[PDB]
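RETRY 2/3 - previous attempt timed out on the joint model. Re-submitting the same 35-residue input unchanged.
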Amino acid sequence: YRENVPKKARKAVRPTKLRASLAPGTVCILLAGRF
RNA sequence: UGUUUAUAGCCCUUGUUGUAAUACGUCCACUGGGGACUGAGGACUGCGGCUUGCCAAGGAUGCUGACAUAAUGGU
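RETRY 2/3 succeeded.
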């Protein structure tokens, strides 16, 4: 009807900062899921 | 029992190593994580930052899932 246009959001996507101990080539236990 | 570093050492003062360290107090417009609750508003204006644009700068978005033959919300 009136078509309220949403306001401009100032949320930009930035790369996730993974844990320092999760380097590739690490042996990691799986906590959830089927495995 | 009595004495004065000797076959243990201790206390006091000064020098030195010294601009010693540390604790405590205070400050950082220094910094790295963990947790919880909230997302009001609804074109654009504004104040700013980085450089027409971009931005954490006048209030949340994005990416996915699963599930509807149930979960949620009730009564």
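Residues 4-14 of chain A lie near RNA strand B (CB under 10 Å from a C1'). Closing ticket.
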